[PDB]
Amino acid sequence: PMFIVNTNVPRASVPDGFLSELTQQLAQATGKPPQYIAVHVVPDQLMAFGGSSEPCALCSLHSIGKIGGAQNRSYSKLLCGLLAERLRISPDRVYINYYDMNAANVGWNNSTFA
Amino acid sequence: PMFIVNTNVPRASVPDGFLSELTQQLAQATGKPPQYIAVHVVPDQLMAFGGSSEPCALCSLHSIGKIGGAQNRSYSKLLCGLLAERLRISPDRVYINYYDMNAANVGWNNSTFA
Amino acid sequence: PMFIVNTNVPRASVPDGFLSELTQQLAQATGKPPQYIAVHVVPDQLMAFGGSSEPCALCSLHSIGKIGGAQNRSYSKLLCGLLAERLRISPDRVYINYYDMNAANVGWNNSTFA
């Protein structure tokens, strides 16, 4: 799986260890090996949520399976919790788009996962 | 909707009020409350369109429904119009990817919209 | 088609000519005139792959059709090859998400491709 967070929170407000914590927590939540988890944090963005420039985030999670109603609710609780506790972003100012990728549509190591 | 614009136009050429204008115009265009709308503008990018580094944009619009042939043509006229007027980007150097998201695949406020 | 690369490799390590090379190589690979090809490279990113911040890349390729098992394997060999040669990123630290877009869901020039 891969997780991207885009936020208007400044770079200096992203704590040491944040990418490592995301990696560990995503491994735990998806049950997948941390070796293949990718994470990407993009601070200092020009963004608004509900017309307001208070702290917010727009995120994506891509996974080959492990995407669905109950799973995505669990991921949202986990990820909004992390964004609130580490970046001080209110959960009601976060969107996360979930993508269930077909293995044939994910490239890696000169080939695909199919 | 959530609207993201990535462009090689520099930050100083993005006019004051642009995020709010995008929010207002998308609210009016989708018939939705502005409290739902998220906007994200990413200037100063290293990009090319047709091999040329003249002003261009790569964009995404995500919505839970309200995505379809006629609706997407209307969004494109609106959004290319704003990019032309405000960022001086030719409409034939803009791509907008439209995504019809399922409510179960959009996280918000510790849960999803399902 | 549109190709986006997000990487932790620094801006100075992206060769002059890289966007033009990507455009030409993708034109040849997708069978499309280069006038339609968009490319976007995002260096200096805060990212990790497998918990490590060694060079890595997270990419996307969007196309109206011409996406599938064998085609995507060929794109992955091409694109991982270029990232390895030009940016010195190991192919096993690259993900490429492939998206088969419907023509009605791609805006361009005040309308869509439908």
Ligand SMILES: *C(=S)Nc1ccccc1
């Ligand atoms: C998870 S091991 N990685 C992943 C899943 C889906 C798309 C890209 C990467």
Ligand SMILES: *C(=S)Nc1ccccc1
């Ligand atoms: C477009 S109104 N944005 C949107 C719709 C539904 C849920 C969240 C955001």
Ligand SMILES: *C(=S)Nc1ccccc1
């Ligand atoms: C290639 S003609 N351009 C393209 C394909 C898919 C989505 C956006 C742009």
